[PDB]
Amino acid sequence: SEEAFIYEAIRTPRGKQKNGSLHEVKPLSLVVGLIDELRKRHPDLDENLISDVILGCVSPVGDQGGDIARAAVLASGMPVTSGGVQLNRFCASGLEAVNTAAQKVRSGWDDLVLAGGVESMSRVPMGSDGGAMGLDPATNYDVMFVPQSIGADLIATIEGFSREDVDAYALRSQQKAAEAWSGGYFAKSVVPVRDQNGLLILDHDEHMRPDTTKEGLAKLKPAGGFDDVALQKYHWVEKINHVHTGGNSSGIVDGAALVMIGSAAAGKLQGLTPRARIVATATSGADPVIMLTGPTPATRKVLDRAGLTVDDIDLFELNEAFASVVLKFQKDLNIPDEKLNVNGGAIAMGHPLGATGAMILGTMVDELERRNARRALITLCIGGGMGVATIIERV
Amino acid sequence: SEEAFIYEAIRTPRGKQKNGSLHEVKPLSLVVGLIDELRKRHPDLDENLISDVILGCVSPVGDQGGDIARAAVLASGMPVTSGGVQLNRFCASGLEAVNTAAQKVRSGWDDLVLAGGVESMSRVPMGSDGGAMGLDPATNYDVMFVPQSIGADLIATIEGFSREDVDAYALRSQQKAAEAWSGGYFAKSVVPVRDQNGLLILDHDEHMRPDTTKEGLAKLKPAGFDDVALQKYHWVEKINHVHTGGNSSGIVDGAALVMIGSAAAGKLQGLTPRARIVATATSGADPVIMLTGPTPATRKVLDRAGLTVDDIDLFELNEAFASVVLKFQKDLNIPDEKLNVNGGAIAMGHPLGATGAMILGTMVDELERRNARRALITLCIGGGMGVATIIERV
Amino acid sequence: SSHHHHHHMPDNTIQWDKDADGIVTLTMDDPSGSTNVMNEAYIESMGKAVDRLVAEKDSITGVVVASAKKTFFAGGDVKTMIQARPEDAGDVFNTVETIKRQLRTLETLGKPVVAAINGAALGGGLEIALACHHRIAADVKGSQLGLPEVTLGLLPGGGGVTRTVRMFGIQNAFVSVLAQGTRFKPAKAKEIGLVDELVATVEELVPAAKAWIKEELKANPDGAGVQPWDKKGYKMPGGTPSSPGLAAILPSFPSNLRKQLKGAPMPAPRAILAAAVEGAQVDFDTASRIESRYFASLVTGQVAKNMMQAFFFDLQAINAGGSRPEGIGKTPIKRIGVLGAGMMGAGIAYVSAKAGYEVVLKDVSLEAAAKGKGYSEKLEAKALERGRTTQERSDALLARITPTADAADFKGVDFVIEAVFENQELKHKVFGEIEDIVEPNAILGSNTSTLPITGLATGVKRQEDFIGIHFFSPVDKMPLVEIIKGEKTSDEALARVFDYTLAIGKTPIVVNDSRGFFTSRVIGTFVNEALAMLGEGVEPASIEQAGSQAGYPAPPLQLSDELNLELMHKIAVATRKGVEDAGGTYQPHPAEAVVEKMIELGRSGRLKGAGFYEYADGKRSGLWPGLRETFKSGSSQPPLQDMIDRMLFAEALETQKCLDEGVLTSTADANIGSIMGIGFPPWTGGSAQFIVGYSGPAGTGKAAFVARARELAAAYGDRFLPPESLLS
């Protein structure tokens, strides 16, 4: 019934893992800093009309445990009626928070919902929360768990992506991320992080290596029992060609992102102008042993649900967990090169697990307005073999 | 929009914390066991139409970490397209999963959603996840965090609930829970837990003390936060500590599932709706007292559904502390005959992430048994939040 | 809460002796057998004894657990475990819960309990000793300690998993003790921690045990009778699953286990690892109960019944002379003469000299015979650098191998084993020049794999002493000997070769004379099914994966390169002539066109440098890249389970034909022969047990096997049709 609109989408810069600028900043502070930025942009907004806060977090332990979303509500002085809920759908947790917010608004029982995600991987590394599958060898023996690094190499092996092919994509992602920063694309969306005195901590994506060459990517070295376990299911494959290095895989970084979602009546009541409209969402999945092929059926589903095709989409944004995942995605749906991750991706700027989905969502919101384009499709491969896709339309 | 319906609601028995029957059972198994029971009750259901599995969990660490909802999908052999997401809204996590499932159905972009929650507090105790607030003293100093038991004592002090008052409610919770088990009310919905050989592990809520007496409750002993609470509630001189282990929720293990789908999704699978999600709401109150949040959430879910207190046949409020229920009863003038009519967490237990789905499924069964129309389910939440849900029997 | 099995009859097993100091000596002495076994009599006996230890606790200061048998305690009641149906899971759980309830009482008595291990302490017996606070072992010959429950498809259910994990941690207990059921000598048992101290003779055990109790009560008064996991501040070695160091590599243990099992459906190691990890997350009592549920899961399962049938009942019946002719006595062997110094003859000379026999290794040239002895020197070299044998026993072993090239050096030989090239007239000449030089009572053995023994026996005059003694490469690591009985072969020669096989540490099966015998014939159908699937267009990687995931030690195409495709074609030429004499010729197996296409291209196997795999510097390196284009690989993609079933059923159905024709005289020979001879997967219990223990979508049992065989016959050909003997 009600249509869900995006009114604002901001994110922090992404600080690297080793000697990172954000390592001294608690993940709660990253979220609170973005809430304060929303207050600076629209100070006359009635915060009591904010009915929930939904944050994605893949490792909700330690500094990220205890429903970090509710903590952000209390620590930022938001109204106590503004809710606060943490969710975890692995890599898509950021976009799942946005999708759930949009679906809650469409049901007519929520007015204005703040969504996003946060992940301080240098303070809470992935795997810190344990895992019901890692601690249960009775079932882990049967689901055939394999780290996503090997599943990516397997995709390159089956599809025939050479080491030079994945390195060529890694170079393109660096080049497009550098061109986006220098061109001022991220000027209004990346909110610099500061300490309690106002001193600067970080104002750019540290993980970027813009001076990357194809000759340096070839010098890198690729990243017991996992290789033989994968081939037990994909039995027609003799050997896995290990092509993915630290230069063509997503970076481990810290960051947070926020997206404001509400109905048309909610924005009109607060003097807000809609930036884009959530057209459709979809969740699907594929084989969990290869673990990174969920984007294709999820994108196919979100297109049929919205009554659209590839020719109707202006921009495609898939998370750059591994180069072969994106090349496989581009090959399946025949995505033109000029539409795919046009502003670089996680290979250059990093993949802060729970926050990535909201970051690349807000990235497409800005690029649609910058290009004066109409539609964008955002998708992410997920651990456990899942897939999430979302279609936004500029207003 | 598109109406959301409840098609099934089941739960495990609640095993106690000390020398409990469910302590040797992984929380992933408690969920898989409930999934397998749903297959037994409806074998010809096309599981490919289940588009998402949403599970509430408050301490998602160790045996409960790594998106236990997705783990249940893969471990139980559910279709790989069935998703799986864990969410944490503290005590209301179970009802938030049901509410989110219902809202996803109402949006139209989901067909059939499996909701519920799981919590094995004897294996993953409360607080195992740390906490963004408890580890940042600079801001934990201004929020003035006070544990839930002192907020409940503060409620009893302000509203004037005596030690005998809260122990009297504790007695009727043990009594009504015993009458519900003896009457067979829970026969269809409590699925016994069995091992990999089919041997029985637990078939009843073993935290119940049905031989509770007024004299026995008076012998229990009550549980610098008191100073901190009175710094905000400065007109209060002394806090009357009236809550013991006999009038507070019990630490238990358990899990629950609620299948939610549209009218079209049920007709396509040959299913019959048991109840309809009328409205949901989320509000809150002061985060120092914490447990006064269910009152504005209930008023908002009534305003949203176009109903009043007189239109509700059954009220179900989680018995976290007796003073919370007594204040809720006092604020909205809830009659005794309609409030937690089959007992609550004081008798049977409060398995955090699963309680919301358990007490919701309890009301689906009691509406059918009583042939009544409406029920309102609400839970007080930590951090000062509230969640309320209205269902109507179909 | 009782120490007895039934809350609502057999003879007593344990003797009771309390001394003046209050030390009770429980001496296990089952009067119905030679070995203390964890049967119903023991459970009731230890139930009475443990009750008495509690009733007289005020007058008891220590307990010693001893045995009057030659062994300490070895074995459970396999006769009872194999009959446990899934509906009996309640009784199986209650039984192991009662056993461990007794041991937990003995363990928490408040006073030290010492195990006086006088001999083999295996399985339940070690679980008894693990329940004691101190273990003293006698360093006698033949003594072993370990938990071999996994080799019978079971798990240590009397507390073995729970206590080894508490003693050594998850990783060490699983890898070293639990997962492979390794047996340790008393010296090595103390080195890893299973035993605490040793004594020279069994007579010192009980005095040393009572002495340790006296010293423990005086030196450690508060810790006496308290295990490490029952003290405050206990820290599990290597950490608990929640410890950060272990939680990193713990989700990778099932994947390491699936790689070692190569995807085979053996569930026992999966359960042991599950019970170990789940047990380390809880207290000792809850962990022990979890171990009981996994044990009941295995015992009531089918794989455990397969492995119990083969590796306990069938193997014992064989070792007890099941196929050995009755009435015949023992006959010594003084000088073994090996004809031919190939890899077979060299391995025969090694396993014979390692047993103490004097070996005369002959070849056509002294250079060749000496190189065959070098096979034994290189094996003794690797055995010396790893410290498994001494320098003195290695010099005495090689001293018994005498290489030569003169037929006169076969003087005094009373046991001949020919290992020359597979050819009838060659074997006739080789035997003709030595049959009058060896002793007149000498056994004339032929290590032939296909040629009928009756034909080879015509080349000698003492045909009653001619017999087939078929070994398997590598002889130093293959446990079976296939004894083929010719028509004129006497029962005495059969028993003498039988006794020889046990003397060298191998397992024999008796086979009547027939082309292909049993091992060559059955393994041929296994290889033929793979080559057929390759011709049908199946990916070579999928074929090899199907072989490993079925449970075979080596995938089929890899094995074919080792069997030589040239020799594989000669078996096709030979079996062609035999059936042409009867009628209807013979239907050439589809694999024969695949063998020829490989020989025409010049790839005959590992011997010729190239086969289905490319071989560079001896080591095998990847499949032949031209293999996919030659046979159009990928055009046929059947289910992996169909590739697996085609290889398992072909061998199982061929085994049933051998049992019908009289080639084999017992299913024990069939099962152990297929397992130990050609590598049939152990989870099946043997190619004959596989029929009665088949499990899949059709169900379980002989009926489900026939159903699946007919399903395969409709798809892949009527060679999978079941014989009349399996129909009912």
From Swiss-Prot, chain A:
- Which Pfam families does this chain map to? Thiolase_C (PF02803), Thiolase_N (PF00108)
> What is this enzyme's class at the first EC digit?
transferase
Coiled-coil residues are none
Q: What InterPro entries does this protein map onto?
A: Thiolase, Thiolase-like, Thiolase_acyl_enz_int_AS, Thiolase_AS, Thiolase_C, Thiolase_CS, Thiolase_N
Catalytic residues per the record? Answer: 91 (acyl-thioester intermediate), 351 (proton acceptor), 381 (proton acceptor)
Q: Which domain of life is it from?
A: Bacteria
Q: Which cysteines are joined by disulfide bonds?
A: none
GO CC annotations?
peptidoglycan-based cell wall; plasma membrane
Keywords, comma-separated and alphabetical:
Acyltransferase, Isopeptide bond, Transferase, Ubl conjugation
Cite the post-translational modification comment. Answer: Pupylated at Lys-188 by the prokaryotic ubiquitin-like protein Pup, which probably leads to its degradation by the proteasome.
| An example Gene Ontology molecular-function term | acetyl-CoA C-acetyltransferase activity
EC annotation from Swiss-Prot or TrEMBL = 2.3.1.-
* Family to which the UniProt record says this protein belongs: Belongs to the thiolase-like superfamily. Thiolase family.
Kindly provide the name given to this protein in its UniProt entry: Putative acyltransferase Rv0859
Provide the species name: Mycobacterium tuberculosis (strain ATCC 25618 / H37Rv)
Q: What does the record give as the organism's lineage? A: Bacteria, Bacillati, Actinomycetota, Actinomycetes, Mycobacteriales
Annotated gene: fadA
